[PDB]
Design a binder for this molecule. Structure first.
Ligand SMILES: Nc1ccn([C@@H]2O[C@H](COP(=O)(O)OP(=O)(O)OP(=O)(O)O)[C@@H](O)[C@H]2O)c(=O)n1
Ligand SMILES: Nc1ccn([C@@H]2O[C@H](COP(=O)(O)OP(=O)(O)OP(=O)(O)O)[C@@H](O)[C@H]2O)c(=O)n1
Ligand SMILES: Nc1ccn([C@@H]2O[C@H](COP(=O)(O)OP(=O)(O)OP(=O)(O)O)[C@@H](O)[C@H]2O)c(=O)n1
Ligand SMILES: Nc1ccn([C@@H]2O[C@H](COP(=O)(O)OP(=O)(O)OP(=O)(O)O)[C@@H](O)[C@H]2O)c(=O)n1
Ligand SMILES: [Cl-]
Ligand SMILES: [Cl-]
Ligand SMILES: [Mg+2]
Ligand SMILES: [Mg+2]
Ligand SMILES: [Mn+2]
Ligand SMILES: [Mn+2]
Ligand SMILES: [Mn+2]
Ligand SMILES: [Mn+2]
Ligand SMILES: [Mn+2]
Ligand SMILES: [Mn+2]
Ligand code: NA
Ligand code: NA
Lengths: 437, 437
């Protein structure tokens, strides 16, 4: 519909509506009231302060700024004291060091203790960096706030906004740096078409170069990769999306697809056509935060995938899902059944002592020499991937993540067929198999 | 029964019986008569001349010895003239250059034209070497002829006597050199227990050393490996047999096992227990000699094995058989059926031009990105190893040996099940699968 027209139309999917802006205003004003009456030194930072927050994602970030000659113990204790004093309800959270999360007039707020430092290079952790992040962007981002929201909304609609482990995508700070570097959403998208996995974007130097990994240099700290948490595959997906958008721009790129909502019969038919074994490991979700859970699910899934590969079941893809009560590790394999008999490698023929040992073992079939080496026919203890995974998960749960594996130890189920389809995983199965509309 | 007693008893399985020795005598005397009346210069060589021929393997080797100033054309023409003149019936054969094979008083004879040379180093091919082979052994082998027959009979009973391609074992000349080097059958067997695939036996130097390959140095020509045609696996089998013999000597080692003679029902049951796909490629035997046929069968079998491996059917072993009218390439695979769907590798995400091409193709399922690279689900044209080989043999017969592949082009059949068992291959199947008694 013309790119410039589509971007005009996309602003309404992306700019927060009216009662959200005022809901934030009322919370901000009230929070300021309460902080001011305590005489605390503070700064509002982040996307609220800069008016770059995406529609639906209202949250306020306040950093408490303390004298440089407070101890690290003194800053944390007093910081949490104030944190608790000014929020309606509160929780003591952790990202690297403690902060307080809570609510003010219905709006989520983080209050974070850090050092007040004139000029950086006195940084200790990411915490003390953050006031400098706001400082750097405040005023470079002025007049570009809707460009930021366009980029955020584009990424969100395509499932790659957020640096948290469940997503492994683009952080808010990364988005604002990109907008400063390229000047607009449109220019970011046009240029991202030529990004590679070796692209280094150095904002402070106005420079793009090549390096070992995709790296977006923090203009406040040259050692920090702002894009650290962006996965290789989400980078690839973004580059491709940028290419697709420019070739045929549409408002559709700013709107999430409503899920496939497939009937168990159609999935049964798809699985029949592909001729694969499709199954899931079901177990109880451990009570840990997403940033801990998701890496364990990734690990568990890979270890089982690697097991299926090693055992010659020719796994195609895996996926995973956490519902409220259960987790699911999903697998599709090209082999439904393998033979009972396999080949065990023995010693080189010269090695008399070890040959004697190899041949000592009772077997149904006679060992043979092939290419200078002994081999034996021996028998598998499982012939399907489901039987294999039942054995693996029963015996090797110690390698499936601390909490995920402990859960699997207490209870797991292998589910396939019309049964697997009853679980809340059909969406994920359809994606894994590349099912079309 | 005591080793020295067993060897005494083995002499009667190995020394030619009475009417064989005299049948040879009568043929030798008659051949001498006919050669002498032509005034031809000749020498009887080989195992007949040295009284080292195994029981049942009577054949006479005569080399016609010509002046050194005959041409290579003159020696071949005149050599075949005499060859034809003195044998009862004859055929013009080929090993490297032509010779005559025929019969005298019921006994097979080869007559071979070569140069009469005083001292070697004037050799042209293997042909002119052979009089020197006899010269070297005549008299070193005296009193050791029964040691040679013991070794030959031991190897024959275990299927590894003969350097021809069907066997890839030990030649007669190799056996006699071994006896000279070690002094006896028993000492050859004791010492062969420590042979490796790098063992070099240098008869003329009285030396065993290490080298790149198993090598038995011809005492008449230091560049010639007398054991050239011995396969690695037959070497391994001999070393193992030597170890087994010394641990528990028996007359059984000089007696061929009578074949397994299995019933189709028992093989059906074995195949069921193993859970494999067992099948054969049947085609008409081309009319070529064994030394040409067997390498082609080996090649055809390997190419199809490599195909089965490449196509993820997990072949265990292969074998082959030639009957009078047909050839059979036999296979056992761990996968009976693979899924319809597989994964096709596409380009790296950066490569826009090739990504566009990869994604252009119509497919039932959507391609995906994994680890920085595109992949597509696509569909196999076969899901069993039998269907795969029908396709491979139909399309790639050009790679299955000149004559074997041409035969397969005209006609082949894939056979499995109660059908495969009707063919004269059950012996070979039982060996391939390591079936016990
Ligand atoms: N684990 C974290 C979380 C945040 N930050 C920093 O804290 C500030 C605010 O973080 P965040 O709320 O995630 O970013 P926003 O810009 O406010 O974006 P959003 O709208 O998604 O909240 C940023 O300067 C960021 O670099 C960080 O270093 N490490
Ligand atoms: N490269 C590999 C990986 C493992 N395995 C086999 O698979 C088993 C499980 O390996 P893994 O899946 O990595 O599970 P862990 O519990 O991490 O391994 P382990 O029990 O040996 O500590 C191993 O014990 C080993 O016998 C193997 O043969 N070769
Ligand atoms: N293709 C061949 C065949 C034979 N020879 C030589 O010809 C002679 C006789 O060969 P052969 O008949 O195979 O050996 P025998 O000692 O007579 O043993 P056998 O009892 O098996 O016939 C030997 O010196 C051997 O080295 C050769 O060089 N190349
Ligand atoms: N290392 C290999 C071997 C072969 N193949 C595929 O398998 C086919 C057959 O290969 P081969 O069994 O070696 O048969 P040839 O007839 O010898 O090969 P070609 O038809 O390519 O000349 C090839 O065309 C190729 O597509 C492959 O992908 N990779
Ligand atoms: Cl910030
Ligand atoms: Cl000889
Ligand atoms: Mg926040
Ligand atoms: Mg001969
Ligand atoms: Mn924020
Ligand atoms: Mn919070
Ligand atoms: Mn383990
Ligand atoms: Mn001979
Ligand atoms: Mn002959
Ligand atoms: Mn081909
Ligand atoms: Na187990
Ligand atoms: Na074909």
């Amino acid at each position: 519909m013309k790119v410039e027209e589509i971007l005009e139309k996309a602003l309404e999917l992306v700019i927060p509506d009216e009662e959200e802006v005022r809901k934030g205003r009322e919370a901000e004003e009230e929070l300021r009231r309460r902080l001011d009456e305590l005489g605390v030194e503070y700064v509002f930072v982040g996307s609220y302060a800069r008016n770059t927050w995406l529609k639906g994602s209202l949250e306020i970030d306040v950093f408490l700024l303390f004298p440089e000659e407070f101890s690290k113990e003194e800053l944390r204790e007093r910081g949490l004291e104030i944190g608790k004093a000014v929020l309606d309800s509160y929780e003591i959270r952790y990202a690297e060091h403690p902060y307080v999360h809570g609510v003010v007039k219905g709006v989520e707020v983080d209050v974070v203790p850090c050092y007040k430092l004139k000029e950086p290079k006195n940084i200790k952790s990411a915490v003390d960096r953050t006031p400098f992040h706001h400082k750097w962007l405040e005023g470079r981002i002025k007049g570009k706030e809707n460009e930021v929201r366009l980029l955020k909304g584009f990424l969100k609609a395509n499932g790659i906004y957020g640096a948290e482990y469940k997503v492994r995508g683009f952080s808010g700070y990364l988005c604002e740096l990109l907008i400063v570097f390229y000047g607009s959403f449109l220019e970011t998208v046009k240029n991202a078409r030529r990004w590679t996995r070796r692209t280094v974007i150095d904002v402070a130097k106005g420079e793009v170069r090549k390096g070992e990994e995709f790296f977006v240099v923090d203009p406040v700290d040259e050692k920090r990769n702002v894009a650290a948490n962006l996965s290789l595959d989400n980078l690839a997906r973004f580059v491709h999306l940028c290419r697709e958008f420019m070739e045929a721009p549409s408002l559709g790129f700013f709107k999430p697809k409503h899920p496939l909502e497939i009937e168990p019969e159609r999935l049964r038919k798809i699985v029949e056509e592909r001729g694969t074994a499709v199954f899931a490991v079901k177990f109880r979700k451990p009570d840990i935060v997403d940033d801990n859970l998701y890496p364990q699910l990734e690990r568990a899934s890979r270890k089982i995938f690697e097991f299926l590969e090693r055992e010659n079941f020719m796994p195609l893809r895996s996926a995973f899902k956490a519902s409220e009560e259960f987790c699911y590790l999903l697998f599709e394999c090209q082999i439904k059944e393998i033979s009972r008999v396999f080949r065990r490698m023995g010693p080189q023929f010269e090695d008399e002592r070890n040959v004697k040992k190899f041949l000592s073992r009772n077997r149904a079939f006679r060992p043979f020499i092939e290419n200078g080496r002994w081999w034996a026919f021996e028998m598998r203890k499982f012939t399907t991937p489901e039987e294999g995974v039942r054995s693996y998960a029963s015996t090797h749960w110690h390698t499936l993540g601390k909490n995920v594996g402990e859960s699997i130890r207490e209870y797991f189920e292998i589910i396939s067929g019309e049964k697997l389809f009853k679980e809340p995983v059909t969406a994920e199965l359809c994606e894994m198999m590349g099912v079309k509309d």
